[PDB]
Write a protein that binds this ligand. Structure first.
Ligand SMILES: [Cu+2]
Ligand SMILES: [Cu+2]
Ligand SMILES: [Cu+2]
Ligand SMILES: [Cu+2]
Ligand SMILES: [Cu+2]
Ligand SMILES: [Cu+2]
Ligand SMILES: [O-]
Ligand SMILES: [O-]
Lengths: 439, 439
């Protein structure tokens, strides 16, 4: 096959992407070993769905798992009556999701389970895939002539040929695995044929962070979770928290082999130790560095010029309300809270008005990083930790280090009941989620 | 008695104003005629209560009317568990209101009934009185040396020796009377002994407006409904809508007699006419001019200098929400609405958070003037009709002409359920009221 493994793509046909997927335990070859994973469409990752604005998606999910499941269309600004976080598909049953892709939309999105209390083991086991919304912007020569690839960043641990079970410490920290994979492959080689690469990046891990850096090269950020920036932004490294996406251009500078690494990063995970009068929690410290893939540049690379502009960011109406959401932890109990409460599906926490804009101040009063996610309503990050964000783009996950406050501009779009929660999915399962109702 | 009639004053004693009032039908002499009014304390107006910050008020209201009644402590920022708009005192029964006068408070306030559906006839019949909160500011020589008077502006109509009954047209327009009185007197004479007068003004009428102007003189506004301005403001005239208060300094310029008038003003009241194929509503147009009192200046008046400053207005925290309240009318039905609804005591319309600040945009989409009142939480008027307010001071009633939007800064103070409503009291009785809950 191609030196660089990427999930199979399924494209809409005549404006319709009609597809039946099954969620099923699947024997497969993974990183040189045989294992049984839980997959969509018989593969890990699941197939990449590629659509355009205004397309119709008709996706029938058949549940062949021994437990209930459902889908979250992560990042898509569609109705929560379709992207329904409360829906349960029992074992053996099917459900058809049908929606129209919004007209003003572009970027890399993804699908995965969202059945409260069961997300972490289901996602860890292999249930996820990407969804790409193609844009007319993709036709500008600076992008069209680039070599494009999707990189699904997901780690895994195996035990007895199956995903390793969650331990109590996993429910506290969020589970990370020793197999740090790209598109389900172990340190693949990307042999570039063009000097400019366009890479769509997805962190589909439960809890692992990727502090991305390519040896000897900067990255040019061109899209965040939910859409393009206004112009490219040069960065020396790029942190991708669980659930986040980004698109970057890479401008290969000379011939050779360059490592794409996940550099050491301390997200505040904890261990336990006993030193003589102890049995207390202790920081794990930063992750060990990982090589994600080997990038081989072509002969005499002459990269394209960068695009001068991408997509202007919408001018938003003045906000009509300010909200405060405070995140806290009870680590030893593995309980996690928003404004002092755990999730209750029957309780509405915030009531907002469709087509108004709100300011949300999300404050992390815990010691761990928490990546905060809001369904249905993409947001503009104004600042984090008192630092203004260096670009305007739509995001749907924002990472908060210990103590940091994120200020978000949140236009409320589709009416209905939806959720916001930490995207360390173990924390969501353990209570760190709330309910927003838009009317 | 004194050439200028003013209500009897009752003052706190040793930090306590403990008083038993009765609401009772009372035969009295009024404007040269014998009539039976409904009064507090056997007089019209009721007695003026004069207190200082931190005083305790203990007022036992005995209901000797044939219908239920209660008290609203208009303008006082106290608890709605005390100033309770839902409380009913049945005929023959008593209730004791007890509260502490807030420390940061000064100005002219008032008390009157607020039993939904019965306010207009009870207020029209004579049930009201003033409450003055004395301030240390009253000791500055520019105020202390002024001659002070209260002017309670209230009109009346008599029929068969009793207040005239409400007609259907009265419920639509709000009732006005032909006897336009000051402190219950018909065009009294004020023989000034000092060149500077300090006049505390109260519009305690159901619906009549007073476009105040003193012949040959400007007025110097020093306080609005709920407190002092920051410095005196010179005005050529001053409109007082129902429920509003103001305090002004008058600087008598020469010897002579000067009329204080209520100049013509069109508040949009309506009549009906039939011209040949008709039976349709027609504007009443502006009120006829009224003389309120005769002011006689002393010999060789040399008024005091004006105070250079009064009270700095508090710096308010940034607001956390913006509200929109739209007022509309169904004139022929005599029904009046806020956001398309009539009052329902069981329904909460707005829920806010104590100690936060809100912006309220109140929009009059009707054709009549409506003076909008909020209980419990005094506000700062930022602008009306797109025109910035020329001073900072606490208000609790804001007049809106047809089409105008008022923008208010509303700090939420005491917790509990309270109301906002039009202070043309017939409109309140006929539905133009809503419920605010502060938690
Ligand atoms: Cu997600
Ligand atoms: Cu978390
Ligand atoms: Cu979610
Ligand atoms: Cu009042
Ligand atoms: Cu009104
Ligand atoms: Cu009221
Ligand atoms: O999610
Ligand atoms: O009132």
């Amino acid at each position: 096959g191609p030196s660089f493994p990427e999930p199979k793509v399924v494209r809409s046909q005549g404006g319709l992407l009609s597809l039946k997927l099954s969620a099923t335990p699947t024997p497969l070859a993974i990183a040189g070993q045989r294992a049984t994973l839980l997959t969509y469409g018989g593969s890990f990752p699941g197939p990449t769905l590629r659509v355009r604005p205004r397309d119709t998606v008709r996706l029938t999910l058949e549940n062949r798992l021994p437990e209930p499941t459902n889908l979250h269309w992560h990042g898509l600004p569609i109705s929560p009556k379709v992207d329904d976080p409360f829906l349960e598909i029992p074992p053996g049953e099917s459900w058809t999701y049908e929606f129209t892709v919004p007209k003003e939309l572009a970027g890399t999105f993804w699908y995965h389970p969202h059945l409260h209390g069961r997300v972490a083991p289901q996602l860890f086991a292999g249930l996820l895939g990407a969804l790409v919304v193609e844009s007319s912007l993709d036709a500008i020569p600076e992008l069209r002539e680039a070599e494009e690839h999707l990189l699904v960043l997901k780690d895994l641990a195996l035990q007895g040929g199956r995903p390793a079970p969650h331990t109590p410490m996993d429910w506290m920290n969020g589970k990370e695995g020793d197999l740090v994979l790209v598109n389900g492959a172990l340190r693949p080689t990307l042999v570039a044929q063009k000097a400019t690469l366009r890479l769509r990046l997805l962190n589909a891990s439960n809890a692992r962070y990727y502090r991305l850096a390519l040896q000897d090269h900067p990255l040019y950020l061109i899209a965040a979770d939910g859409g393009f920036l206004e112009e490219p932004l040069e960065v020396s490294e790029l942190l991708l928290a669980p659930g986040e996406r980004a698109e970057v251009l890479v401008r290969l500078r000379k011939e050779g082999r360059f490592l794409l690494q996940a550099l050491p990063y301390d997200r505040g995970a904890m261990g336990m130790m006993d030193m003589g009068g102890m049995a207390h929690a202790m920081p794990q410290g930063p992750s060990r560095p990982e090589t994600l893939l080997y990038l081989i540049a072509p002969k005499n690379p002459k990269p394209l010029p960068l695009p001068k502009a991408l997509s202007p960011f919408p001018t938003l109406p003045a906000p009509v309300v300010t909200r405060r959401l405070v995140l806290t932890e009870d680590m030893m109990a593995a309980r996690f809270f928003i404004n002092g409460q755990v999730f209750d599906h029957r309780r509405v926490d915030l009531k907002g008005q469709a087509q108004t804009v709100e300011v949300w101040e999300v404050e992390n009063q815990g010691d761990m990083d928490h990546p905060f996610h809001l369904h249905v309503h993409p947001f503009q990050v104004l600042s984090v930790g008192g630092r203004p964000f260096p670009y305007r783009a739509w995001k749907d996950v924002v990472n908060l280090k210990a103590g940091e406050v994120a200020r978000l501009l949140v236009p409320l779009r589709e009416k209905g009941r939806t959720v916001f929660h930490c995207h360390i999915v173990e924390h969501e399962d353990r209570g760190m989620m709330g309910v927003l109702e838009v009317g």
